[PDB]
Amino acid sequence: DMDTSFVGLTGGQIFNEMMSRQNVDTVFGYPGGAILPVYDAIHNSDKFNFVLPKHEQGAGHMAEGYARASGKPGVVLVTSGPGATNVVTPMADAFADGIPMVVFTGQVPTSAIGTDAFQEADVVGISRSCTKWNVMVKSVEELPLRINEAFEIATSGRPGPVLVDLPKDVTAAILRNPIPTKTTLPSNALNQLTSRAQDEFVMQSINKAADLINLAKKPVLYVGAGILNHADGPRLLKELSDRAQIPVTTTLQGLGSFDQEDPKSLDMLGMHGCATANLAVQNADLIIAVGARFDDRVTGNISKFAPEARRAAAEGRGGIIHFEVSPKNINKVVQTQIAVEGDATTNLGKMMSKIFPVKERSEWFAQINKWKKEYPYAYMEETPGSKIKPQTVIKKLSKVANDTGRHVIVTTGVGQHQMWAAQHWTWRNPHTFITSGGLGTMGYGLPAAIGAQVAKPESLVIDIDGDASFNMTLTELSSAVQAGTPVKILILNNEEQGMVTQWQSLFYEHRYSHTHQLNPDFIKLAEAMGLKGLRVKKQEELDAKLKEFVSTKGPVLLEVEVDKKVPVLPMVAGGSGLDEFINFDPEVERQQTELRHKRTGG
Amino acid sequence: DMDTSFVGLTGGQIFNEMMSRQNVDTVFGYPGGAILPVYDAIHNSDKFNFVLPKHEQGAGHMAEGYARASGKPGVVLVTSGPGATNVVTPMADAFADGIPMVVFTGQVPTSAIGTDAFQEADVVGISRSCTKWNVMVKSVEELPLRINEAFEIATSGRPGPVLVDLPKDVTAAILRNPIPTKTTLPSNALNQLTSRAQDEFVMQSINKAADLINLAKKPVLYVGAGILNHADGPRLLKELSDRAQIPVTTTLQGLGSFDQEDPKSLDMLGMHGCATANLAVQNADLIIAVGARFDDRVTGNISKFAPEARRAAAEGRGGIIHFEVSPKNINKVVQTQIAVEGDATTNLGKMMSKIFPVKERSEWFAQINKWKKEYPYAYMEETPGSKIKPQTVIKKLSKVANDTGRHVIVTTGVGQHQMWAAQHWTWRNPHTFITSGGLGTMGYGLPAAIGAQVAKPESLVIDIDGDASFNMTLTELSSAVQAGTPVKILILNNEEQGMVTQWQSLFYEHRYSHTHQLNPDFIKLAEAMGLKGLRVKKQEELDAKLKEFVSTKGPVLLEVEVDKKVPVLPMVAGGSGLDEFINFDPEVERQQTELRHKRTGGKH
Amino acid sequence: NTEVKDLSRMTIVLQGQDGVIEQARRQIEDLVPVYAVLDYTNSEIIKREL
Amino acid sequence: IIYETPAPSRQPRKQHVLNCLVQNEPGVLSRVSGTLAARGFNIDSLVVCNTEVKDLSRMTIVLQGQDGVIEQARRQIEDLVPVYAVLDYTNSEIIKRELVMARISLLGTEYFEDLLLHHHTQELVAEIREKQFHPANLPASEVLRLKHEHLNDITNLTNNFGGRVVDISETSCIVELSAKPTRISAFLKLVEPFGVLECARSGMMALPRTPLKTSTEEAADEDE
Amino acid sequence: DTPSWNANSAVSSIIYETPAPSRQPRKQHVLNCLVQNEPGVLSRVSGTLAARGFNIDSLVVCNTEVKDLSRMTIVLQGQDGVIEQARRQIEDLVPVYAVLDYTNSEIIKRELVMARISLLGTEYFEDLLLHHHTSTQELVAEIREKQFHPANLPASEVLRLKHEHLNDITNLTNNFGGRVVDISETSCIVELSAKPTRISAFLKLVEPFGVLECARSGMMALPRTPLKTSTEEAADE
Amino acid sequence: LVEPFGVLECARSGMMALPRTPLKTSTEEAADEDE
């Protein structure tokens, strides 16, 4: 079967039509010499929108936020040479956090490839290890096929980035003959013949999964971002926590999948997760992994992770159940007892009703609620005679933005502000938290916030960024006022690299080696970018500025001067287990404050 | 073999000592988690002056500028994951232009490698295509050796970038065993021991090259950036130009290697080069290629490149002589009759004795003077009522730069402004022009200027950027202030992506698609970044404010609004050869001015 | 190279525990241009070398 | 003779052979293959061979194209830092060998047509199984003899090409052969009608003959 | 016209032909006893093993061309703890010097088979096997009615089939490293010595022709030597 | 074994494989004692 609706059109003209065939309504990117034949065709296109940044790295991050907000693949259309190499970092970010996007990079003509040509780069080779799949379109005949293959792979299984090189001579050439349109994936050939074998494997394992569930005395629903890759994801998640009465803990990327207003929530775990969740996991006899990959930031120490669950495994009392879509992430970190391969949402729907509903777990939930009482997000709350504490700023903004009666999407950078924004903020409704965890890219806050509002124009996007992170992509300010995105930008300026200074204070004797950068005047920077800038120095001014920003029509900037050297707590680092966390203590925080000055002097 | 100096030191402490043993006094980088044990050792070190940018890409470009100015390798010290993926563009840039730099990237502990760990990326596999050579240090025992191997390759033959991936457990562990600090490179080091079959072989090519020069009637000296990779480079080039009285043409990266106000100067050749040099090449019977790689932007149509030189080779009267340090670039684009492998400067010095002295060339040397008059650098000059234009801006800037008396180092972005700053500026001193030619990266100007200023503090570093090139690596103005670098930032604001709009006006019927970004206020931007920002809008406000921009003591910004959609001429594109160029014509532009308003609808 | 158009066969030899090597199999098999990665250990095969 | 004698075709092509001496550092295999793929070379085979020397590998790259084009490839690989040297064996008397292991059915063409169509996932299925020499509608004794008849015919082919039958089952027979690629393909074409179940060609390993061809023309060349 | 494999159908055939695990995690245990040739040593080595319930597969007493010295290659199955127990039981016997363990050593296993194979085709063998079965019924006419049965062929045939079968059996025997030692008017005798699993393969391939008589004996064993190169010997640590 | 003579030059491939099916006699496979 071949198509014939592209006969007479150039490669660029075909690209334009493929966007409508793949339901693309927004394309990010930056023009260039080798990508000219494509841009000449999408000139004033009626198929999609075009957000034009000023750095290719921005366009990549804008596609990530556009993907996390809506659920559609982010499209990036840049040129060859340096224009393509600037999209490496967002592809690495999308490869780690698993973000669906299709990157179209330009390329020198095929007759010039391998001659060290002008703006020629081995993009296929460079982006090979940070993409699920890539290809260089050799002929215009392959172009309609490779695009369909790219989008399918980017959406199949675990979503991820794919790159497609578009040489100039290929996009300029004219198709004069029929072409194959539907994809040719070898993964389909195996799964078709081995359908019933896999179908019976996952069903018989579900039965065994539902068996150990009914044997669990103190189970814990360990959820990741895998449940967010489905519409009815969080819907079936809460209906399992309601049925079997299971407490729910979540990872940084899975945040929002479970409304922590629910009495069964443990929210975030891990290195900077609450002590309530870390202890709940450690004392659990059966851990049900729903769309998580057991990151090292989550487990703390593999040697001593979930000791009671490993005990119940050897006794046949419990163990670990892992709902996984990609068998590569099974038993690569910790060894499970039951493997259920496939979409976590669709798998839970088939395991459902084979489970025994529970009235109440008296003893288990009691110690859990007791853990909240003795181990909450404890920190040094600000006094009237002191500088603004950063933690409370999030907790304040949490209710201010939520009571506007709007759909709020939160985007952060990478640092202490990133953790604090995830700890105190209450996450109602899914797909409301967009951040970088797997790679942890700075300057990810602003561009992702812009692209997220492109997908959801009615929704209120808020960027809780840090000064060091914001300094990497503060260039993309005038792109928000060009794309018509009324983004809300918050800067928790501590005039330092908090996440690094924290480690340097605990493990390196307060030796801050080049972690203090010279921040520009943000308020005048915004005005230079044609954007409303606001600041707040004292504590009493904060309550008026937060309400002024969230209600501001159009792009606005908010800078909050916070305290110096504030460690994110509780912390699970070194060779310590999740139960061996560093708890907060205002006295040892005072000693660490006074002894810091003595080793510094300034 | 072994060394007992690093016994008791950690991987970080070794790295701190290795930099001084490799003669490094300037380090660009950005801290991170997986690179903490290294930064803890370089804390308040008395060996090198650390520079802290706002983005890792800045750190890499500042290392390029530091290498293009000083000559010493530019060291980059970043972290793992995203910190390593941001220095990819600077590496690919230095790998295309041949810039010596050593990139140290952090890495997750060796135990965590291959587990999709936090801030983990296949940095080696990524930078494999855009570096001269990369390596991951597997143990503290290899650390002093891998660094030495990195700096050698980065400066051997044609200089380039190298990547050294540093795991946490490697840079934190304590070395307790004596280890080698020198091993032979299997590709060149021990292979070059068969020198008799190489030193005496190249000597035969040298003698045959000199005989062809003395036999040449219309010889053109094709000079690239390779002659700048030596101290006595430009000197021996000038000496040859006086011995055989041959004219000298240079590439974009070859500018500064030869005096341009000399009667033997053919200025720049290539796509946007002068018609004099292009017609000199097409009509030459012998072309002496010195340190150039015959780029696509220079040769144009390869099937039409130097038809007279190819004809002379068939008659045995001339041909092409190539001086390359890398045999891989020999006979890659053009067929070379006689190649002289090795350093160009070294080979030129051992050929003077075999070259006959020439008093004066008559017929052909007077013909190129006719081309200088008939086909010079022409453009639409300014008229009362019209706004400023870039050609006259660089013209005047070049005059007020010589009026200072300082040492002038010029860096540019990438676009139309890059070409005008290359041709209309009079280059006379080496290592003065620093631009991105091979990869052509935008936003390269500002950080390369900073890095060049660090190399030469008492030098006038001028950055000729575009509105699109600048406002890409915009944040690095806060780094110029922090590092305390008196750089001169100039912006030719035509409110467009000029170089692309030209291609759209010539080859796509004035159909500009997303070729106009929304520029911010550059003088309010400068104020926010912490440096005074000037702006020229009126025509008579140019000269009077052009001296203030240069005489300013410290970091300064200048926005000069210029004319729009002005094509860079001459131009060699399509299947056109070097003799099939397109020069300036006041009548054509007048029609193109009305045609553009008609097709765009008066929008531009 | 088998005698089938657009089909190649790769033979890999590893060392380590079963848990590490099985993961390597699942890591390669998940790749796009591969059909299936078979495990020939604990199986009667004809090993050859030249 | 005039009718049968071989003839060329439009757009000719010739084979070039390179031999790389590389250092066995981490990577290498990805470096050389990547460098040759990032420049769009032909590349018919790579084949990494192990020398019995510590930290020294050897690769045999098969190429095709103009002599000046493949020379660019040689200098492109030699520039790599772990590569000692790259030698050109295209103009020297060498020994090129390739290993091939095929399964090859014994049940004949009719069963092979059935087996292929079975895994290709009608009316033509019935016609295949209605052919005279299919295992169906044919006595068990004649099938037994036709198995060994095919087994012998395959054995004689492998013997002539200097190969061997290493395995014999009730329906197939694994064969082994190490020869020139031009001879390997010749054998695979001859045994093709028997129906090849599985197959695996190593590539090409090259080792130059020790320089010796003539006895009387050694010093009586008088070419000087 | 010969058809060719599809890119997809080829993969399907491979994984379908790829056999499931048809073997236990346990392996073939081989013990080599060194016994003194005293009157009744054979009866007590066997008796010790038989009285303790060990699953033995063979025994095989071998002479070693040394006076009053013999060796027995015992092959059995079971756990390592069971085999070692069986080993210590035998070694405790006073006419036994030592019992070596070859279950994890590079050895050379050898069975010796002699079998008479019919040349008169499968039909005659099926008839003969049914004739001798009737001891201590309309099939006898059903078999003798089949095609390629001797009674249903001319005298020129069968003679031509006997030698055709003879050629097939010989080629099977030659490939396995055996030989045809006797050629009768209606049958032939083969001789083969190789691995026990290689003998089993040979006796399966030659089975359809018809095995009139057979003698497989047991397995003998002699340790090989794992020689590796000087660069693989230097692979210590 | 060839080493003592002196190996001047060596080229040794990796390792390729082709699956084999272990044949067993009808009497040996009849032993289906899976009780």
Ligand SMILES: Cc1cc2nc3c(=O)[nH]c(=O)nc-3n(C[C@H](O)[C@H](O)[C@H](O)COP(=O)(O)OP(=O)(O)OC[C@H]3O[C@@H](n4cnc5c(N)ncnc54)[C@H](O)[C@@H]3O)c2cc1C
């Ligand atoms: C400074 C910093 C500190 C951090 N500290 C923490 C911390 O303390 N705690 C924490 O939790 N995170 C933390 N992170 C983030 C951490 O690095 C990881 O990115 C995070 O653990 C993400 O885990 P995840 O499994 O939820 O998301 P992912 O990495 O995206 O997990 C992917 C998994 O989801 C599965 N999946 C996807 N879709 C489906 C589907 N449809 N069906 C089934 N399975 C599916 C995939 O197969 C895969 O196994 C931190 C990040 C930073 C930058």
Ligand SMILES: Cc1cc2nc3c(=O)[nH]c(=O)nc-3n(C[C@H](O)[C@H](O)[C@H](O)COP(=O)(O)OP(=O)(O)OC[C@H]3O[C@@H](n4cnc5c(N)ncnc54)[C@H](O)[C@@H]3O)c2cc1C
């Ligand atoms: C928009 C744009 C337009 C451009 N148009 C033009 C144009 O019209 N004309 C033009 O000239 N350029 C132009 N360029 C630049 C062009 O793309 C190439 O970068 C330019 O040809 C580089 O000059 P080069 O080849 O001489 O030097 P390089 O690219 O740096 O090559 C150096 C060569 O010399 C050899 N070499 C290096 N060191 C030594 C040594 N010590 N001894 C001996 N040999 C050595 C190297 O092996 C190498 O082959 C343009 C760039 C841009 C961004």
Ligand SMILES: Nc1ncnc2c1ncn2[C@@H]1O[C@H](COP(=O)(O)OP(=O)(O)OP(=O)(O)O)[C@@H](O)[C@H]1O
């Ligand atoms: N179906 C079979 N099963 C077992 N052996 C067979 C079979 N068919 C043939 N043989 C015999 O196996 C021999 C192969 O000898 P080979 O040199 O390959 O032994 P090998 O390399 O040690 O492999 P293996 O370990 O499997 O025995 C054939 O020559 C043939 O004599």
Ligand SMILES: Nc1ncnc2c1ncn2[C@@H]1O[C@H](COP(=O)(O)OP(=O)(O)OP(=O)(O)O)[C@@H](O)[C@H]1O
């Ligand atoms: N029907 C047969 N009668 C006699 N000899 C035969 C017959 N068939 C084959 N032979 C030949 O006898 C040879 C076997 O002789 P062998 O090598 O076994 O000597 P042998 O051990 O002394 O046997 P014998 O004691 O019977 O003479 C066969 O290889 C074959 O050449």
Ligand SMILES: COC(=O)c1ccccc1CS(=O)(=O)NC(=O)Nc1nc(OC)cc(OC)n1
């Ligand atoms: C990007 O160039 C190519 O892809 C290329 C590279 C090597 C060889 C040939 C080409 C095609 S081209 O010569 O015709 N140039 C082109 O398509 N675009 C083009 N745009 C420019 O402005 C943005 C500037 C510019 O180089 C000065 N080239």
Ligand SMILES: COC(=O)c1ccccc1CS(=O)(=O)NC(=O)Nc1nc(OC)cc(OC)n1
């Ligand atoms: C950087 O860590 C790793 O490369 C890594 C990855 C996987 C497993 C182990 C490590 C080392 S580590 O756990 O001990 N982390 C570390 O040394 N520094 C560290 N610095 C932070 O702030 C800059 C933040 C942070 O993660 C939240 N880790």
Ligand SMILES: Cc1ncc(C[n+]2csc(CCOP(=O)(O)OP(=O)(O)O)c2C)c(N)n1
């Ligand atoms: C591109 C990149 N560079 C460096 C790092 C290492 N890093 C992680 S957090 C951090 C400091 C960021 O501080 P900031 O963004 O200001 O957050 P804050 O201190 O305000 O909490 C650094 C340098 C990184 N993750 N990514």
Ligand SMILES: Cc1ncc(C[n+]2csc(CCOP(=O)(O)OP(=O)(O)O)c2C)c(N)n1
């Ligand atoms: C990172 C990057 N993106 C895109 C390009 C393609 N490109 C080359 S010049 C240009 C427009 C820039 O023009 P400008 O910087 O404003 O200088 P001008 O042409 O106006 O003089 C573009 C988009 C590039 N070389 N590098």
Ligand SMILES: [Mg+2]
């Ligand atoms: Mg900060």
Ligand SMILES: [Mg+2]
């Ligand atoms: Mg511009």
Ligand SMILES: [Mg+2]
């Ligand atoms: Mg021959």
Ligand SMILES: [Mg+2]
């Ligand atoms: Mg064998």
